[PDB]
Design a protein around this ligand. Structure first.
Ligand SMILES: [Mg+2]
Ligand SMILES: [Mg+2]
Lengths: 263, 263
């Protein structure tokens, strides 16, 4: 239906989405190098203010998992920090303690700060931290309020949602006027199979797909991150002429385009 | 006096101090590489939590000069930010708006957070942002209140202090019980001369010298900073066997030692 109103009905369309921009110099590096429009920036990242592009969104953050670099909240609510004053290292920690009003403040802050740095087009969430029903409600409400399109998957099977969340999630997912995407995450999959993952996209039937990558340049700074092998594999696969050819087979779509059509 | 009560009267004594640790993975790297005890850590830095060593202080920040990486206030006082929510880019921007109560909350916050990551022995200020009289007062009160020795220089010549501040700064510089160091900074002097500057320390009389360096390791992330040539120059100087030998002729003194002697 969305594809319909974009006159793209029946086509295979692809939103290729670069995550975790602003987190390291290497990530921004890859974003610059790769030449593709779409990503979202982590406003608390040190390099958040080093990124520029045509299809940029705000990657909302409420957790900081790595030993380093770590990020700190913008606002001063206690429920959001753990306890060097960084965001919690795990979702479990977050979901157990964060109060909704404190979260909402923090996200409002993140969005407004972003809007001082590029023109945000969309909104999504690192580690799907907005998965607590509670917050998911905040997330969608915010997206509407700021006229930014949120990332909504068609189904939440395979996202490891905690089961007690399902009933209410399913609930407002079903109730949302927002377009849903067919979600794809090659994160979790072994680095050496990444190439083949991207090459196999050639086999997908028509439909609107959302594929996320975490490309980072191979760098000493980058290798301080535990998941670097998977971040580099994204980067090399995307630069591989075969993959570039496969990707060309999709009509490429930006959130900017989608936003024009909803707001 | 202080040299006297350390039983060091008459000696050539050096505090060698590594600045901006926590700023980049290249700085932290240089600290490790150099194996020397003393530096201080920019707590709002992304790599703040990646450093450990025996003589670490908190490098307080109230300004973020580069276009990236940039740093944000821990607390949410309005007078500390600019208008993207970063620390302002110049002393001038800062001094014309910062409130003292807010600065106090902020530096307090930065101190608390540093305690969580290591055992702080001292206190200094990035770009000497505490030079506004007002805030210099704040700064020494806090050094008191947390039993950390503050950076206090002997002369304030060539630190570009706005002239109308000299009177008040001279007053409290005069009244403070805290020991004053003989400030040396090769920051300013051309990268290719640097090796010279370090060797010419051979020619220094007895006294208490504070030498600040910004050593950083050759790195794509490091070189994202405009002043990298001089950062890397410090590193190559201090890792040169000649310069280590000349530094040997000094009695190395940690801020830690100073702290026991005074608290
Ligand atoms: Mg993420
Ligand atoms: Mg500094």
């Amino acid at each position: 239906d969305l594809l319909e109103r974009l006159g793209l009905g029946g086509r295979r369309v692809l939103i290729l989405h670069h995550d975790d921009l602003g987190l390291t110099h290497a990530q921004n590096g890859a974003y610059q190098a790769l030449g593709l429009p779409t990503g979202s920036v982590m406003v608390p990242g040190a390099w958040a203010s080093g990124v520029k592009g045509e299809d940029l969104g705000v990657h909302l953050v409420l957790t900081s998992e790595w030993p380093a670099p770590r990020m700190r909240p913008l606002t001063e609510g206690e429920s959001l920090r753990d306890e060097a004053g960084y965001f919690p290292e795990s979702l479990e920690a977050l979901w157990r303690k964060a109060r909704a009003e404190e979260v909402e403040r923090e996200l409002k802050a993140q969005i407004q700060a972003a809007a001082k740095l590029f023109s945000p087009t969309h909104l999504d969430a690192h580690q799907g931290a907005v998965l607590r029903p509670d917050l998911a409600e905040v997330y969608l409400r915010l997206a509407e309020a700021y006229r930014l399109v949120p990332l909504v998957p068609e189904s939440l099977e395979g996202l490891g949602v905690p089961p007690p969340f399902l009933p209410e999630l399913e609930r407002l997912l079903y109730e949302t006027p927002f377009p849903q995407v067919r979600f794809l995450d090659p994160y979790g999959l072994p680095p050496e199979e990444r190439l083949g993952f991207y090459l196999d996209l050639a086999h997908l039937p028509p439909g609107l797909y959302y594929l996320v990558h975490h490309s980072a340049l191979p760098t000493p700074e980058g290798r301080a991150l535990p998941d670097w092998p998977t971040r580099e594999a994204d980067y090399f696969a995307l630069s591989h002429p075969e993959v570039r050819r496969v990707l060309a087979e999709f009509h490429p779509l930006t959130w900017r385009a989608v936003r024009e059509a909803l707001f």
